[PDB]
Design a protein around this nucleic acid. Structure first.
Ligand SMILES: [Zn+2]
Lengths: 128, 216, 81, 181
RNA sequence: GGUGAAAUUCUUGGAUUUAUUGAAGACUAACUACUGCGAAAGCAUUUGCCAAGGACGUUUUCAUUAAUCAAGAACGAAAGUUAGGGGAUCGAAGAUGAUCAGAUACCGUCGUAGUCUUAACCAUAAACUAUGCCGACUAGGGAUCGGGUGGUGUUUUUUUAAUGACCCACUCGGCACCUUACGAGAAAUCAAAGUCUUUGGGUUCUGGGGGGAGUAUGGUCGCAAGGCUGAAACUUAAAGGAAUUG
């Protein structure tokens, strides 16, 4: 019953996938790993594979420090941007839940505006 | 090269006595060396925990409480109430097409010089025999409902300090009071107070905090 | 339909139509003889009244104006004449 | 050590849910072996795991993703394909994500993504081995990471106003360069 | 960070990230609909003040005071001009980068005016329903918004009277929707684009094959950008629209 709880931010952007594990108070972080720290290719930084590797590494580190259960708070880049988590976020979440940590109270904390300022692209959209 | 997590020590954070389970978790902090104590680096942290982990039941699964850390002694850091919010998923599920959203807020003060901003929410409904598909409401109805909700919220806040307000907000008796008052104007399903937050604080007054704590 | 008598319409179909769009237009209002309980005076009020009419005897109220017919006050006698 | 996931269901998807209910929970309790319940009063689906079951928290994650994918409007067999294979993911974005269309322009962009009788949509359905779902204004793509990236680029080019002929040609080119490896 | 891939950029004075607090300007998501309002352009957080409007109801009052309208006048999206303010985001100009067969992926970062506001200008938009305004008649149906009428109809008073919400029927005025052809049309399609070779209810504006050409010139408005009015010489046998078939 005396299992120490932390919280894990999962930042799922279209270029990187941040996995951050902190204690209950948002300060005093424990372990932060990005997608680029596990892959050296300059093209697989946003891939689900890099997110999975980062989640495994941060799971090993958080098991080492002492904590054994984390509440997951996942978010996209948000704002005027896409505001919906991408496949790197689900990959990191599945790899975190796979490695034996107790997972409870999964909640999306993406920043959603009350119809805020303009976005880049200028009337013809981001040409993609 | 230094392994900073070895010099750190863990402290035990415990909720105020108003909730059922008054032991909420653990936190870690650096060792109290010279010219930077471990006390003053801890006296302002705000945690956010779900209400169910405070109350056990699953009927309070959507709410969550922000608790500010106020005092510390002997690994025990003592907290107070700072705010309440719904989770985002419940807020997204409540908003539905073909019905009217109603929001209201007031800023008020308690018996002591706390300052609160409180946000209440409501939606319309159909009373089980309505063939009409939407059941919107006219603007005079929404204005009357905002006035009634604002007056109830103000009356139920200034009549007590923060302790009885939390003790009245945990079993959500204000929602049933609003449902009683506005049922003669329009149906109004799904009435909640979606958010409360502190704005300004008076002097610390450790006696009141230690009176709220100090049991068990 | 298309074989009928527009000169002598049936009373139900004649009363279902608009006041203006009747074969001969005429009012749908009436005058109420009102006896309030505070006295024995009789007041002839309009059914579609627009003012808070009040009789001179004991001078309290007879009716309240409304967007359609005037809503009466508490229980008073009224005859449709 | 019981672990639970409690996820809500929108109303317009709940009446097909029970309509397919007998096809959903048996594999989840036979092939994957959890506790699955439908709490109608809170409008939610509850999944609980216990150490009596199989040693697989990833099974619980897969079941949660299964229910969450089906409740967005996806088909049942495609959700089963999500449940068995472990490579498929979901991407979701709005039309206003790409270009702030309004009024009839958003309606015509939706009609451009779909096409007559879904035919245009069926094209991106075929040449990318994905699963496209058009909501009121947001769109979801299901499949592998490269496949959903291809479908995202195709449908973004559809939103911005490119005619269906160019995306047909680009789609056959990408399908030819895709199936050759 | 960034793209298909790079490079510029920031960073062991700690960048990106997480937590607490403050400041600034802009905008009002989800609710949001074949729903509402306004002469149109256009209009979405709460509350207060000010005047204004339509529809309904009326056994009120005036009694033809009315419809359309060269002259003349008010308003008129965005961009733009002139002085003051404010400047968060985005961003014409400009600055720099890699410019790798192809960018199917002609892009990246910073950023001026501008976007916001006050006081004056300008008067144009695919300013579109591509359908002038007023009036009359002609067809079925289901919805929905505002008012009104009838119901020993349903529900909440804390004892079941009132009001509110709903249901059923009728009516007036709306925004619209599905089918049809007694009719119309080149056709797509239209309850008007009908009541038209069986041609006439009232009244404004406009067009007369295409280029030259919204051009020259004159006049006039505007500080300017430009706006309004606006030809001919010459030249040509086409130009155009609606459906079917590949
Ligand atoms: Zn009286």
């Amino acid at each position: 019953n005396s299992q120490v709880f932390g919280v894990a931010r999962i930042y799922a952007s279209f270029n990187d996938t941040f996995v951050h594990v902190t204690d209950l108070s948002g300060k005093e972080t424990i372990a932060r790993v990005t997608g680029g720290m596990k892959v050296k290719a300059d093209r697989d930084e946003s891939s689900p594979y890099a997110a999975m590797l980062a989640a495994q590494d941060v799971a090993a580190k958080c098991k080492e420090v002492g904590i054994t259960a984390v509440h997951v708070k996942i978010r996209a880049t948000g704002g005027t941007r896409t505001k919906t988590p991408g496949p790197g976020g689900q990959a990191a979440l599945r790899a975190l839940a796979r490695s034996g940590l107790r997972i409870g109270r999964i909640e999306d904390v993406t920043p959603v505006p009350s119809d805020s300022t303009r976005k880049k692209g200028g009337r013809r959209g981001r040409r993609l | 090269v230094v392994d900073p997590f070895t010099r750190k020590e863990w402290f035990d954070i415990k909720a105020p006595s108003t909730f059922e389970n008054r032991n909420v978790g653990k936190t870690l902090v650096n060792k109290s060396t010279g010219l930077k104590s471990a006390s003053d680096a801890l006296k302002g942290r705000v945690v956010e925990v779900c209400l169910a982990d405070l109350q056990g039941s699953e009927d309070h699964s959507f709410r969550k409480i922000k608790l500010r850390v106020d005092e510390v002694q002997g690994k025990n850091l003592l907290t107070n109430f700072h705010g309440m919010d719904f989770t985002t998923d419940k807020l997204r599920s409540m908003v539905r097409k073909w019905q009217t959203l109603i929001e209201a807020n007031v800023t008020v003060k308690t018996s002591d010089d706390y300052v609160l901003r409180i946000f209440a929410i409501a939606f319309t409904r159909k009373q089980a025999n309505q063939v009409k598909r939407h059941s919107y409401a006219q603007s005079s109805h929404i204005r009357a409902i905002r006035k009634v909700i604002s007056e109830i919220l103000t009356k139920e806040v200034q009549g007590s300090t923060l302790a009885q307000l939390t003790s009245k907000l945990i079993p959500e008796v204000i929602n049933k009071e609003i449902e009683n008052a506005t049922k003669d104007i329009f149906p109004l399903q799904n009435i909640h107070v979606r958010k409360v937050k502190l704005l300004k604080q008076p002097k610390f007054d450790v006696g009141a905090l230690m009176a709220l704590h100090g049991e068990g | 339909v298309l074989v009928q008598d527009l000169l002598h319409p049936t009373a139900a179909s004649e009363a279902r139509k608009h006041k203006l769009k009747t074969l001969v237009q005429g009012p749908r209002s009436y005058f109420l003889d009102v006896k309030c309980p505070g006295c024995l005076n009789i007041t002839t009020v309009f059914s579609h009244a627009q003012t808070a009419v009040t009789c001179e005897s004991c001078s309290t109220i007879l009716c309240t104006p409304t967007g359609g017919k005037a809503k009466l006050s508490e229980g008073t006698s009224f005859r449709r004449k | 050590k019981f672990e639970s996931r409690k996820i809500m269901v929108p109303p317009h998807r709940m009446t097909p849910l029970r309509n397919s209910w007998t096809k959903i929970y048996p594999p989840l309790v036979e092939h994957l072996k959890l506790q699955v319940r439908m709490n109608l009063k809170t409008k939610s689906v509850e999944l609980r795991t216990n150490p009596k079951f199989t040693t697989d928290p990833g099974a619980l994650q897969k079941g949660a993703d299964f229910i969450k994918a089906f409740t967005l409007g996806f088909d049942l067999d495609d959700s089963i394909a999500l449940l068995r294979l472990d490579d498929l993911y979901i991407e979701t974005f709005e039309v206003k994500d790409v270009k702030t269309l309004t009024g009839d322009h958003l309606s015509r962009a939706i009609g451009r993504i779909a096409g007559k009788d879904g035919k245009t949509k069926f094209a991106i359905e075929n040449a990318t081995r994905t699963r496209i779902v058009l909501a009121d204004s947001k769109i979801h793509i299901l499949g592998g990471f490269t496949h959903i990236r291809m479908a995202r680029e195709s449908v973004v080019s559809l939103i911005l106003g490119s005619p269906p002929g160019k995306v047909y040609g680009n789609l056959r080119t990408v399908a030819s360069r895709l199936k050759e490896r």
